[PDB]
Amino acid sequence: DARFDIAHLARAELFSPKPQETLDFFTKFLGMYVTHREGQSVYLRGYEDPYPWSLKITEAPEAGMGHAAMRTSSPEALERRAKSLTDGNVDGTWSEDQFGYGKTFEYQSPDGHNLQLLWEAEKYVAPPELRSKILTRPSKKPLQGIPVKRIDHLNLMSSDVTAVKDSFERHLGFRTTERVVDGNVEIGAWMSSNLLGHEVACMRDMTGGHGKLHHLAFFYGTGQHNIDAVEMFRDYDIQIEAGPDKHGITQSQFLYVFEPGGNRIELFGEAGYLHLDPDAETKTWQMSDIDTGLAVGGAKLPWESYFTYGTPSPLSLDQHIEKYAHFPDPDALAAELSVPDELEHSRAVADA
Amino acid sequence: DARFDIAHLARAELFSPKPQETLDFFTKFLGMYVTHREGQSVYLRGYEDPYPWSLKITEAPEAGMGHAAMRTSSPEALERRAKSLTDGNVDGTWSEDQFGYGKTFEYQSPDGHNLQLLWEAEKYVAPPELRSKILTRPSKKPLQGIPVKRIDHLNLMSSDVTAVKDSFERHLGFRTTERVVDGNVEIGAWMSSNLLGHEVACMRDMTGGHGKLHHLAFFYGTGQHNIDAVEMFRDYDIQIEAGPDKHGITQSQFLYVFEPGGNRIELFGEAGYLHLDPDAETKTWQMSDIDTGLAVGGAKLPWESYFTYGTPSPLSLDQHIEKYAHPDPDALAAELSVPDELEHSRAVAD
Amino acid sequence: DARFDIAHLARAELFSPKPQETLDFFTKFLGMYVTHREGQSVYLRGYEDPYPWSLKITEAPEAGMGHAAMRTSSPEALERRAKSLTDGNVDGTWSEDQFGYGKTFEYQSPDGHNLQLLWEAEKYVAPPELRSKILTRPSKKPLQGIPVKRIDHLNLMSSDVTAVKDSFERHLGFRTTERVVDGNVEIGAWMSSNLLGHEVACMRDMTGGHGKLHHLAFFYGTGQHNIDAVEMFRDYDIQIEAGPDKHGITQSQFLYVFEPGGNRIELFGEAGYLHLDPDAETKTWQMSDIDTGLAVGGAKLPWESYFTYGTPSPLSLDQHIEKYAHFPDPDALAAELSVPDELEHSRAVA
Amino acid sequence: DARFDIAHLARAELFSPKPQETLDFFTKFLGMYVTHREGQSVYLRGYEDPYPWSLKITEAPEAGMGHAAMRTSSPEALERRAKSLTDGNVDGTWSEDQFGYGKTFEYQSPDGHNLQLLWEAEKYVAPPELRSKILTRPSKKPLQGIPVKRIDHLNLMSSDVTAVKDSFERHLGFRTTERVVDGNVEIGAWMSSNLLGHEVACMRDMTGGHGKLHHLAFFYGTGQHNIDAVEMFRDYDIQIEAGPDKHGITQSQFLYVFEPGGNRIELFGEAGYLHLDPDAETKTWQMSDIDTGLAVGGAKLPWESYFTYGTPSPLSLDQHIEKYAPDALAAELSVPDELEHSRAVAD
Ligand SMILES: CCc1ccc(O)c(O)c1
Numbered sequence A: 001d002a003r004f005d006i007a008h009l010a011r012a013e014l015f016s017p018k019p020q021e022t023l024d025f026f027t028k029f030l031g032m033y034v035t036h037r038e039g040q041s042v043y044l045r046g047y048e049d050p051y052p053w054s055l056k057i058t059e060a061p062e063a064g065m066g067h068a069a070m071r072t073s074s075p076e077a078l079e080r081r082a083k084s085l086t087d088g089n090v091d092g093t094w095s096e097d098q099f100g101y102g103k104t105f106e107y108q109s110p111d112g113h114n115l116q117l118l119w120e121a122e123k124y125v126a127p128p129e130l131r132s133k134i135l136t137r138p139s140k141k142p143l144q145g146i147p148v149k150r151i152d153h154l155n156l157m158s159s160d161v162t163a164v165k166d167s168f169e170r171h172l173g174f175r176t177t178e179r180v181v182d183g184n185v186e187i188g189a190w191m192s193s194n195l196l197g198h199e200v201a202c203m204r205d206m207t208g209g210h211g212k213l214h215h216l217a218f219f220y221g222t223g224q225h226n227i228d229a230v231e232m233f234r235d236y237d238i239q240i241e242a243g244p245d246k247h248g249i250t251q252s253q254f255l256y257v258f259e260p261g262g263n264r265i266e267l268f269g270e271a272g273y274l275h276l277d278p279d280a281e282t283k284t285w286q287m288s289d290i291d292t293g294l295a296v297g298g299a300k301l302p303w304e305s306y307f308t309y310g311t312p313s314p315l316s317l318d319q320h321i322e323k324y325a326h327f328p329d330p331d332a333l334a335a336e337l338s339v340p341d342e343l344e345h346s347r348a349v350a351d352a
Numbered sequence B: 001d002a003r004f005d006i007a008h009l010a011r012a013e014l015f016s017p018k019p020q021e022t023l024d025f026f027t028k029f030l031g032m033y034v035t036h037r038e039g040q041s042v043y044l045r046g047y048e049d050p051y052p053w054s055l056k057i058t059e060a061p062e063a064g065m066g067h068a069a070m071r072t073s074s075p076e077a078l079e080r081r082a083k084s085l086t087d088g089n090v091d092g093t094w095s096e097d098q099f100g101y102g103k104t105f106e107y108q109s110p111d112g113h114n115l116q117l118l119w120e121a122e123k124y125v126a127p128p129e130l131r132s133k134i135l136t137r138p139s140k141k142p143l144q145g146i147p148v149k150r151i152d153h154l155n156l157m158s159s160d161v162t163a164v165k166d167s168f169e170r171h172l173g174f175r176t177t178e179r180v181v182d183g184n185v186e187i188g189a190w191m192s193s194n195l196l197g198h199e200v201a202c203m204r205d206m207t208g209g210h211g212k213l214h215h216l217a218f219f220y221g222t223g224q225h226n227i228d229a230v231e232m233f234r235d236y237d238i239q240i241e242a243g244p245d246k247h248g249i250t251q252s253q254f255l256y257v258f259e260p261g262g263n264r265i266e267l268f269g270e271a272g273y274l275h276l277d278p279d280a281e282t283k284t285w286q287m288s289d290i291d292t293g294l295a296v297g298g299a300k301l302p303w304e305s306y307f308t309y310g311t312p313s314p315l316s317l318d319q320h321i322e323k324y325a326h327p328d329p330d331a332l333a334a335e336l337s338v339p340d341e342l343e344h345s346r347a348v349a350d
Numbered sequence C: 001d002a003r004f005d006i007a008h009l010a011r012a013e014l015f016s017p018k019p020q021e022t023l024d025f026f027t028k029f030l031g032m033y034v035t036h037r038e039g040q041s042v043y044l045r046g047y048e049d050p051y052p053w054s055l056k057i058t059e060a061p062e063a064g065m066g067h068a069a070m071r072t073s074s075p076e077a078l079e080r081r082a083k084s085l086t087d088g089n090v091d092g093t094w095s096e097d098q099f100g101y102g103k104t105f106e107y108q109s110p111d112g113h114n115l116q117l118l119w120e121a122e123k124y125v126a127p128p129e130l131r132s133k134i135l136t137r138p139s140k141k142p143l144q145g146i147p148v149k150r151i152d153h154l155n156l157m158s159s160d161v162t163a164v165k166d167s168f169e170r171h172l173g174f175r176t177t178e179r180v181v182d183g184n185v186e187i188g189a190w191m192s193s194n195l196l197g198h199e200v201a202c203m204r205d206m207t208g209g210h211g212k213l214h215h216l217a218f219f220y221g222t223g224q225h226n227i228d229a230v231e232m233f234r235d236y237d238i239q240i241e242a243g244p245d246k247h248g249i250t251q252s253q254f255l256y257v258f259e260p261g262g263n264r265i266e267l268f269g270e271a272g273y274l275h276l277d278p279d280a281e282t283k284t285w286q287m288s289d290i291d292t293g294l295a296v297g298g299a300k301l302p303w304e305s306y307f308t309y310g311t312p313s314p315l316s317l318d319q320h321i322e323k324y325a326h327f328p329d330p331d332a333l334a335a336e337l338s339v340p341d342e343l344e345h346s347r348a349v350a
Numbered sequence D: 001d002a003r004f005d006i007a008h009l010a011r012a013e014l015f016s017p018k019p020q021e022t023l024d025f026f027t028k029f030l031g032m033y034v035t036h037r038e039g040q041s042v043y044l045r046g047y048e049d050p051y052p053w054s055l056k057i058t059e060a061p062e063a064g065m066g067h068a069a070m071r072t073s074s075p076e077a078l079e080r081r082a083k084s085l086t087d088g089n090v091d092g093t094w095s096e097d098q099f100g101y102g103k104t105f106e107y108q109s110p111d112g113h114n115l116q117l118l119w120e121a122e123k124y125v126a127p128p129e130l131r132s133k134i135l136t137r138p139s140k141k142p143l144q145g146i147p148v149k150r151i152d153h154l155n156l157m158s159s160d161v162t163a164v165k166d167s168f169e170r171h172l173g174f175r176t177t178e179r180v181v182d183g184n185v186e187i188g189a190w191m192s193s194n195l196l197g198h199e200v201a202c203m204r205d206m207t208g209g210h211g212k213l214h215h216l217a218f219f220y221g222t223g224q225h226n227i228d229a230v231e232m233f234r235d236y237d238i239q240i241e242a243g244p245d246k247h248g249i250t251q252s253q254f255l256y257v258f259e260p261g262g263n264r265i266e267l268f269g270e271a272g273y274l275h276l277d278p279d280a281e282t283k284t285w286q287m288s289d290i291d292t293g294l295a296v297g298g299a300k301l302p303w304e305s306y307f308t309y310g311t312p313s314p315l316s317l318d319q320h321i322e323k324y325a326p327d328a329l330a331a332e333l334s335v336p337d338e339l340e341h342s343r344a345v346a347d
């Protein structure tokens, strides 16, 4: 019974070709605290992240995810999960080289995403002047930007959603709370080891790419903060993809923006739907279900980015939107033909 | 100085070919109180509308606005406004035939919209069991749907925005707070006689049509109520056009839906930007300004309805969206008349 | 490792001497669905409660909690927890007499609270016309009142908080996320088996009573809905105890009211602080810590009800408030002397 | 017909004996822009204040209101209002000595409050990098604190509420939208020249004092910003008096705090009830009406500060709360018990 072996998503690393601008996004707009700098990397936490960092920004020639690490529910759970992966012929490596954390198992998803498992995590203790009167809160909410509380979840792009889902289910004990299917093909899976709808999702890469990041998400817990965040991004020249609105899938209040390095960042409002029922069936969204899945309100997710752009991208975001909006390309048409039309021409999709 | 002669938008009448479904939308979803029924009409108010009705639903073979009435700030202001219109060769009629109101001056905008001015308005008094402990609140907030407080504003579609704007400015003393221009052509004007951004707007009908209703708006004052409303509309099968989001123009939180009779209804969240500065210049939105004007967030206003559909429509809403989403030489004529920064804005979906 | 054996709080039963008024509170104000009636009981769920009921209202001569049931994470977990309790000399009984559920283990807390454990629970299926387009949502959000999504948590009053806490920790595998201490005495414990701050809390009965209910809580997930709920309760004559505000303890947005039968009901806004860190130390609130624990904002929790009234009460709520506000009683003064003054004269207490 | 002669509340000046801490409160917590410094004063605006300042912070030995200025609807309206006041034997002064503004009429309320009228007001224009894409918004919302949009309203404490009300009604053309009465005594009056419930209120000073400031208020327009603001104030050691909640009177979402200099500041959420009906009767709140007037929710307004403390105060805030938790008893006997022992009052 692996169900309870993974506790939560501890941290993630973003690659940025504009590391200072990425850093300024996370500090000046999202009010994250800087806890460490070393080499070409800067380490940040939200004010309610429990460990010394949840986000690592690393200078790189391209955008994308350096890794994501999940924290286990015990040291024994870490041994059981690492052994399951090894016995499943997954190549792993043991490391202990990150500030604030100990012994870490590194491996790749079936599509090449860098994933990590750990137990050993230091509990962040604030300097006295940053301690909160709220005792569950390890540091005061900053006075900068619209500050995020913590990391929320990860959305991976895969050439094969089922292979990534089966890895999380079989080796990590995750359940799939919700998925989107087109005939017999899984094009999205939302997975969790706890009450959350998901901490890890996987969506089909319609461009044939491998091992990409769709988005990293941070948590506000309040829908208004997405309204405040989008008004900030609009007036301070950050590109907005879609939202604020509410996904039918997970019932999460969402806002998607592009940080200056080109990674897609999601801001999450109200937690939404907690999976208290311990043996709920997977909810499967068909193409007849699909419209509400994307957005309860009037929001339209752009075809030319949402369904096709992740990081690293062989094209700039501008070049990507150009190509997939046809500003035809055989690649763009291949993507269009692989996607079912109820999804492609949904009232919750706009095609530039 | 006509600046202060119009107090507010008192009421509007919608025509509906599905009058019971229209009624059910306003009572079951928007929790409006029914205060009267007469002939082919039902009369409603939101719980903070001050007079016995703000909304009249009238059975008709087509959708659209039967009329809108503005209340003046005094009986003398009513005489001054009616005289200004008469002296400007606007042909008006005096009537006194509506429940809850008295003497009314009826006239047409330059584009044929049925407009009215009145002073005499009964103050709604609730039955004892519906009185509020909040003394400015004339009736308890209902326990039905996501209830609207009151009427908010009117958006008129016109072949000629400037002619409609000039009428409100010159004859009613309105100021234009904000407008959208493309070269020398005004494609929208937002007009007010008070601190509100607007109680009356006028937007260019890009199909060349005349005298249509773009939308009637009702007020919540809370952005969350647009979120609650859109979830209600989504799960109870009302068509949603755009929002919830926030218009840069007026800084209003908006949600646009179609009531079953085909009229566009807007739900307004937070009041937004109050015009306290008594001599602010008109803010002119160009096509370089335009994206934020439509929506601060990621909302996309559909080309195929928002810019082209109003009531009455020579086409059904489904037939309209079919035609303007495609080609039709009429749809292409509309596309060529609209500037591309507006047409291909990141705040427009085709 | 019992940590993961309990999944969540499935349901609770309230006793009411005004059963029809209690039912009207939960249906007309809180928009709960009625799924079953049997004997002198009615069974209700919120629109996102997974089983056919989360709330049972039972006619009785006094208010209070008939029982609360927790659902296990497997059938094996139910056998393990029942065996732990039996091996600990706790008297249990096996039953299967409730609509929508199967085999149930009934036992009493160390202070006499009726607690139950079960695995077998039917999944509620709505009639076709009440199914949601939101596939995690088993039934549409109703158009009545400010509807609650689901049951949230339980707050038990005990003569001995530690005895109740040790039962949940040792027999059910709960962790204590937060607690309030006065010297060496635990006067509150907040306990969870999952990411929630708590599904079960226990607070010290300062009157020397045993086995009472402090409150049952339902979930909105949205702070505005506590604002909407309190405005509804205010204008429709429900007694409001405190809030809306936010507890420092759990970081939960709260509103406390009394349902007409005399039970204290809490409405919860935003989920607040999720316990993602699997081995966080218990956070201990002292009397120097205390003010923020009660309320982040300006809310004052009334001494004369919050700290002293639970159900069943030897007095009516009005008689209770009379006695503990001294409208002195040696019993009221005994309660005052047992409570530390930092708690009693906190800026978060009136 | 003076009804339309006053447009809005342009600005106010606060006195502070802790001028730097007061400044830090308005910049670090409330995100106000500093536009000028001169002598012992600093000038600030919210990002949607139309003129170069709405707030002036002035070093002084005691807290309180230096002045409040209302903007008229025309230059002629300024001449008419000034003439009405002088014809009523009110002592007025003409001045033109403030940054961002021109010709000003200064006078005192019947109770000694420093009030001003002006027409001439410069329109603030942001530097290019601070201009908003929202064209009605003259400067970007700052990235600092929970920033206020603009000044909202003023609440004056008076030994005689009726005398202050009569001045605003008869000389400035304000209407009283709502008031609280006890028998034939006005305990509160909420006054407006526009759709707002009020831009000026006056409440009875139960201590027998004269000419005090109860509070100055700033606008968010969003209830959540009061929630965000109170959490900020709680964790950064600002004293919170009451709220967040909603006043039945005006239907305004409110939060009351003390800035470090001792002045009471109110943060306003949703605008609430707009007075569109041009000839609504004044709504009179009795002592049977009273509970909802104070707070729709569970909020309790503290007797020991809310009903008795204003600036300048002969006592520190701490000394005031100490005393009001013969003078305290005189205050208690003058206040009717339905107000004093309301479920919306804490002692
Ligand atoms: C399209 C549905 C969905 C749901 C939850 C997410 O966090 C997300 O990015 C997308």
Ligand SMILES: CCc1ccc(O)c(O)c1
Pocket: B155, B217, B247, B249, B250, B252, B254, B266, B293, B294
């Ligand atoms: C397109 C800008 C705009 C602004 C305010 C409105 O009420 C509206 O309907 C439209």
Ligand SMILES: CCc1ccc(O)c(O)c1
Pocket: C155, C217, C247, C249, C250, C252, C254, C266, C293, C294
């Ligand atoms: C006194 C702190 C507290 C915290 C959370 C609750 O749900 C509650 O009822 C009380």
Ligand SMILES: CCc1ccc(O)c(O)c1
Pocket: D153, D155, D201, D215, D217, D247, D249, D250, D252, D266, D293, D294
């Ligand atoms: C006590 C009622 C009330 C109403 C509006 C306010 O601005 C205020 O400060 C007080």
Ligand SMILES: [Ca+2]
Pocket: A336, A337, A338, A339, A340, A341, A344
């Ligand atoms: Ca296709």
Ligand SMILES: [Ca+2]
Pocket: B335, B336, B337, B338, B339, B340, B343
């Ligand atoms: Ca064009």
Ligand SMILES: [Ca+2]
Pocket: C039, C097
């Ligand atoms: Ca039974």
Ligand SMILES: [Ca+2]
Pocket: C335, C336, C337, C338, C339, C340, C341, C344
């Ligand atoms: Ca004591």
Ligand SMILES: [Ca+2]
Pocket: D091, D092, D093
């Ligand atoms: Ca003089």
Ligand SMILES: [Ca+2]
Pocket: D332, D333, D334, D335, D336, D337, D340
């Ligand atoms: Ca008294």
Ligand SMILES: [Fe+3]
Pocket: A153, A154, A155, A215, A217, A266
């Ligand atoms: Fe996501």
Ligand SMILES: [Fe+3]
Pocket: B153, B154, B155, B215, B217, B266
């Ligand atoms: Fe509108």
Ligand SMILES: [Fe+3]
Pocket: C153, C155, C215, C217, C266
């Ligand atoms: Fe509780």
Ligand SMILES: [Fe+3]
Pocket: D153, D154, D155, D201, D215, D217, D266
């Ligand atoms: Fe105020």
